[PDB]
Amino acid sequence: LPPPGPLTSGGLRVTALGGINEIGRNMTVFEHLGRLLIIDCGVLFPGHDEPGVDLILPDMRHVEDRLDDIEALVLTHGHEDHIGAIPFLLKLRPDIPVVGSKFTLALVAEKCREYRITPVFVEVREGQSTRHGVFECEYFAVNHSTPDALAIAVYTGAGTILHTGDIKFDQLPPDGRPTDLPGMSRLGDTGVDLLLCDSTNAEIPGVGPSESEVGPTLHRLIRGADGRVIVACFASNVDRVQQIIDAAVALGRRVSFVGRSMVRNMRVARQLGFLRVADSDLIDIAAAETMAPDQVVLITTGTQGEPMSALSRMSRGEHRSITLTAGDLIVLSSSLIPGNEEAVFGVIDALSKIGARVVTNAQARVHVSGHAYAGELLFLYNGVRPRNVMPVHGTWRMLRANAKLAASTGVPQESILLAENGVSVDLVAGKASISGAVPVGKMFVDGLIAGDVGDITLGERLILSSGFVAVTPHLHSRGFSEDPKALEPAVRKVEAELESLVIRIAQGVRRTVGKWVGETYRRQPMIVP
Ligand SMILES: [Zn+2]
Ligand SMILES: [Zn+2]
């Protein structure tokens, strides 16, 4: 598919630089009358195809040469796949206004300090409007698995856009602030031309359970526990922490946070008023072991089995302050992100060896998702009634599911646009269509440089998982064998090819050891001259 032409004056162009064919690094660029508005700037964490890499960024080459045009960066909420790449954007232009709610802006402040950046903040709350050049924005309360999420209406001259952010429709969130479906319904009456809609759970039928179903289950588990209780969850889910604390306090226990991410984030949550707990209900971690075990609940990180997490360390008998016993109850108040199963089940099995009881979502209602199920999205589609629909935040199977949901409410199929990263969507005179594609790749972060690591380097790293045998005589290897005498049978055969007189040395003994190995050992390490 070809690149798009110029954008008809007065129209609007929408393009994702990440987040559409995958879960992660969401970044969406809106173009209008030469100016730019960006909604979200997240990272993607690397998989097996990307060894040695730290982060994956949205493809910023597409704004690198027009950074002067960006009017603002607007942020739905504070999860890493929406804010993680902000330091790299601000390194390109440090004074881009950054718009968001108080809790969101607190997280990017802390993230941007790691890179020695001080953002220009414009702080925003639901119900408020702000102007950013040719763009105007209005913010709608969203309930999600993290406080202070916001959905965003963008008004230009081309019409009205609505971006949901990560959206869910819990009608009884513990914090009593459900998503503002009324307000978005009234905006639908106004006429919304384009709806950008979270697809994460679009293939799950029905309506998802309330986050408030978790509290009673945790209360039941703590009441029945004879010893200490340990609850692992995500530090960003303040309403989950609040329910753990409320259950523990209601049963005469005190609470302790374990792990830097948990300690830092609950500090922010307490300061901004999202977490309400009395100082006498908290114990410092280095003083929790002084009390009776049945008097403490520990709240930790490490739901994903990351080896340096607090719960991993505890499961191996290598936590400084805490030692686990068969009398402990461990609750994984979370779900298993795909690609982490081997690691999570390893921690569970180390805990089972010790004799501790482990409770996961598979056995009890200890976790709910933060994204709307298909039946909740239907409420959104009937409430907003968008003239056109673009699914975002999802892989193809999710984007397609969301497409059908919108179709089944009456959105014409020609008005349901599926635009992968790099595919533009033009909204012109009220009609919306796909207009062309540019290529987008994965920008890698590996330490202090970036951009010198690419397909060939990852290929070499993948090959090197069988070690390497290097010739340039002295034979050496590293990921190959523990037998020192294993190099010798190749030394004789190397000189033999060296009695040959007539870079061709490279392809000469590199081909000579390669035959010796794929014959003696039937291994295939990398051979380097
Ligand atoms: Zn999120
Ligand atoms: Zn997300």
The helix (run of H) or strand (run of E) holding residue 229 is: strand 229-232
Measured in angstroms, how far is the CA atom of residue 146 from the centroid of ligand 1? 7
The neighbourhood of ligand 1, an ion, using CB within 5 A, equals: 79, 166
The superfamily (CATH) of domain 211-359 is Metallo-hydrolase/oxidoreductase (3.40.50.10710)
User: What is the C-alpha to C-alpha distance for residues 15 and 204, in angstroms, rounded to an integer?
Assistant: 27
State yes or no: 219 annotated in a binding site: no
**Beta carbons of 147 and 211 less than 8 angstroms apart:** no
Beta bridge partners of 7: none
Is 81 annotated to bind a ligand? Reply is: yes
Residue 357 corresponds to which tokens in the numbers above?
Answer: 């009881």
Ligand nearest to the CA of residue 81, numbered in listed order: 2
Measured in angstroms, the resolution is 2.4
* Listed residue (58, 17, 150, 62) closest to 419, CA to CA: 17
Angle 131-134-137 from CA coordinates, rounded to 5°: 35
Question: Looking at domain 450-527, which of 3.10.20.580, 3.40.640.10, 3.30.300.30, 3.40.50.720 is its CATH number?
Answer: 3.10.20.580
β 194-198/159-163 pair status = parallel
Give the number of whichever ligand sits closest to the CA of residue 236: 1
The verdict on whether residue 369 carries a ligand-binding annotation is: yes
Residue 166 annotated as part of some ligand binding site: yes
What does the DSSP assignment read for 287-315? Answer: GGGGS-GGGEEEEE--TT--TTSHHHHHH
Q: Which of 511, 467, 505, 512 is nearest to 489 (CA)?
A: 512
Distance 166 CA to ligand 1 centre (A): 5
Say which ligand is closest to the CA of 369: 1
Question: How many Å apart are CA 445 and CA 100, to the nearest integer?
Answer: 25
| Amino acid making up residue 410 | G
The residues whose Cβ lies within 5 A of ligand 2, an ion, are 81, 166
Distance 85 CA to ligand 1 centre (A): 14
State the DSSP H helix or E strand holding residue 240, giving kind and residue range, or none if neither.
Answer: helix 238-250
The ligand whose atoms approach the alpha carbon of 150 most closely is: 1
Establish whether domains 211-359 and 450-527 are of one fold: no
3-class secondary structure per residue, 129-141: EEEECCEEEEEEE
Query: Is 367 annotated as contributing to ligand binding?
Result: yes
Q: How buried is residue 74: exposed, middle or buried, by Cβ count under 10 Å (0-12/13-18/19+)? A: buried
Report CA(76)–ligand 1 centroid distance (Å): 9
CA 382 to chain centre: 29
398 CA → ligand 2 middle, Å: 13
3-state secondary structure 340-355: CHHHHHHHHHHHHHHC
In a 3-state reduction of DSSP, which class is residue 413? helix
Compute the distance from residue 165 Cα to the ligand 1 centre, in Å: 8
Distance 364 CA to ligand 1 centre (A): 23
Residue 291 to residue 285: CA distance in whole angstroms: 11
The structure's method of determination equals: X-ray
Q: Are 39 and 12 a contacting pair, CB within 8 Å?
A: no
Find the 83 Cα to ligand 2 centroid distance in Å: 10
Name the residue with tokens 């037998």: 483
- Residue 12 Cα to ligand 2 middle (Å): 24
- In angstroms, the CA 471 to CA 494 distance is 9
Judge whether 163 is annotated as a binding position: no
Helix, strand or coil for residue 516? helix
23 alpha carbon – ligand 2 mean position (Å): 7
Q: What is the DSSP letter of 143?
A: B
Distance 365 CA to ligand 1 centre (A): 21
Helix axes 396-408, 374-384, angle to 10 degrees: 50
Helical (H) or strand (E) element with 242 = helix 238-250
Query: Rounded CA gap, 115 and 357, in Å?
Result: 42
Q: Are strands 229-232 and 194-198 parallel, antiparallel or unpaired?
A: unpaired
Rounded to an integer, what distance in angstroms lies between the CA atom of residue 299 and that of residue 275?
14
Burial zone of 485 (CB within 10 Å; 0-12 exposed, 13-18 middle, 19+ buried): exposed
Query: Do the annotations mark residue 144 as ligand-binding?
Result: yes
35 Cα–ligand 1 center, Å: 27
Calculate how far, in angstroms, residue 321's C-alpha sits from the geometric centre of ligand 1. 32
Cα(13)–Cα(432) distance, integer angstroms: 9
58, exposed or middle or buried, with CB in 10 Å at 0-12, 13-18, 19+?
buried
Q: How far is the CA of 371 from the centre of ligand 1 (A)?
A: 8
Q: What is the DSSP string of 45-112?
A: ---TTSTT--EEE--THHHHT-GGGEEEEE-S---HHHHTTHHHHHHH-TT--EEE-HHHHHHHHHHH
Among 383, 25, 16, 379, smallest CA distance to 171 is for: 379
Q: Which of 280, 270, 209 is nearest to 249 (CA)?
A: 280
